[PDB]
């Protein structure tokens, strides 16, 4: 039982080490200095280069249908250099085959898709913590208020089962609803070889959504949705009902701390053997890595670096939809809601004035650390809608879940003595997007 755990830690550490040494190689090939190599924007550009090089289907489509004024075999992005204290952006182009060769050499001749999925999840968490998806919600007919279930909505399809565990109930419901809408518009959907393939995809997506749910009634209802040969308006409405029910009887969404490649690269250049020590995405390893890591970022004029650092922290720990009180307790500084953050996204646009831009250190440090959970809490005839409604009516927004679990100090590596928070003082806000 312990041996399997140590092999799992070794495998995850192998992925992290590969990502870090790839970042080191990319920094060497880009002639970036230490400060420029620790910039979060440069790491974002490099990670996007990796992801676009290995996006096989998009690369093939680009070869068949070339883009306007772009070479379909070259990736690129904004790389920022500091000259005489002034930041300037550059668009440098790299062959996709060169990027693939460098990535494979980083992972010892193996095309380790696990690290790519890790970077994909990091980008998805950043997008979740930065940008809201209300327009897509309204277009598909779902309430804009179920944003807490839309974790991992920007994850592409190539993530697979690893990324499927991260995406929430809202995104899966949205994708299924898109499929049902396409079937409703065109009857030739679900027909032919493409019809068989999309039926298989629909069944698989329904099955992983069913695995997401906890109560028996929700599982039975998604089973009934899956069993329809030609799902129509009724199944789309039932999916909307399940999505709304997921607000109270929550689902099992897996949360992992996926750090930017700059942190991993700095750690690997420091001499940290993740293969020997081992890495966990749900334990103290990301917290310990973030405490002694220095990351720099680009601050547009009239912005608060503290707010940007809080945003990056929330993205790193996938705490976008977390209770603000527990997030502030773990961080030690007040996690301000999205409305009161005087900051825009991490990424810098191509039209920005790259002469007033400044650089700031990111405070990615927390007082306490906690275990990241997959569970959504405790949940306590042939029409299971009434049963679901009764179950949610019984629930109150005062029940204590995760009983006997607390936040551990950074020195408590083994998670022995928990600290339970007492939120029984004057009430702060609880919803990040509120």
């Amino acid at each position: 039982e312990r041996q399997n755990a140590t092999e799992i830690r070794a495998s995850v550490g192998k992925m992290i080490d590969g990502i870090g040494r790839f970042y080191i190689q990319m920094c060497t090939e880009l002639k970036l200095s230490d400060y420029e190599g620790r910039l979060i924007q440069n790491s974002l550009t490099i990670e996007r280069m990796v992801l676009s090089a290995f996006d096989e289907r998009r690369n093939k489509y680009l070869e068949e249908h070339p883009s306007a004024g772009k070479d379909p075999k070259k990736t690129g992005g904004p790389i920022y250099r500091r000259v005489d204290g002034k930041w300037r952006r550059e668009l440098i182009l790299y062959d996709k085959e060169e990027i693939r060769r460098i990535w494979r050499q980083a992972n010892n001749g193996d095309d380790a898709t696990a690290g790519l999925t890790h970077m994909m999840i990091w980008h998805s968490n950043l997008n979740d913590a930065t940008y809201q998806r209300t327009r897509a919600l309204v277009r598909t007919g779902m309430d804009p208020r179920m944003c807490s279930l839309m974790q991992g909505s920007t994850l592409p399809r190539r993530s697979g089962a690893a990324g499927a565990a991260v995406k929430g109930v809202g995104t899966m419901v949205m994708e299924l609803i898109r499929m049902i809408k396409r079937g409703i518009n065109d009857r030739n959907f679900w027909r032919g070889e493409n019809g068989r393939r999309t039926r298989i995809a629909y069944e698989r997506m329904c099955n992983i959504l069913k695995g997401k749910f906890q109560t028996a009634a929700q599982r039975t209802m998604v089973d009934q949705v899956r069993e329809s040969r030609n799902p129509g308006n009724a199944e789309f409405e039932d999916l909307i009902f399940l999505a709304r029910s997921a607000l109270i009887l929550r689902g099992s969404v897996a949360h992992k701390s996926c750090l930017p490649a700059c942190v991993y690269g700095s750690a690997v250049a420091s001499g940290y053997d993740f293969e020997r020590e081992g890495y966990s995405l749900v334990g103290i390893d990301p917290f310990r890595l973030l405490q002694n890591s220095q990351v720099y970022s680009l601050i547009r004029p009239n912005e608060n670096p503290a707010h940007k650092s809080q945003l990056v922290w929330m993205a790193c720990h996938s705490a976008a939809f977390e209770d603000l009180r527990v997030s502030s307790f773990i961080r030690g500084t007040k996690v301000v809601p999205r409305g009161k953050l005087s900051t825009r996204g991490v990424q810098i646009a191509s039209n920005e004035n790259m002469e007033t831009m400044e650089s700031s250190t990111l405070e990615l440090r927390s007082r306490y650390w906690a275990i990241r959970t997959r569970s959504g809490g405790n949940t306590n005839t042939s029409d299971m809608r009434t049963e679901i409604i009764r179950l949610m009516e019984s629930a109150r927004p005062e029940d204590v879940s995760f009983q006997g679990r607390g936040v551990f100090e950074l020195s408590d590596e083994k998670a022995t003595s928990p600290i339970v928070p007492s939120f029984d003082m004057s009430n702060e806000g609880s919803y990040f997007f509120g």
Binding site: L247, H255, D323, T373, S401, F432, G434
Partner: peptide
């Protein structure tokens, strides 16, 4: 509009808050 409910990330005791009247008013 906004965020009605919390999706827990950290395994901590905590009350899990949600806007009960808003969720329930769509089920009455």
């Amino acid at each position: 509009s906004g965020q009605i409910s919390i999706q827990p990330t950290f395994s901590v005791q905590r009350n899990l808050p949600f806007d009960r009247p808003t969720i329930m008013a769509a089920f009455t």
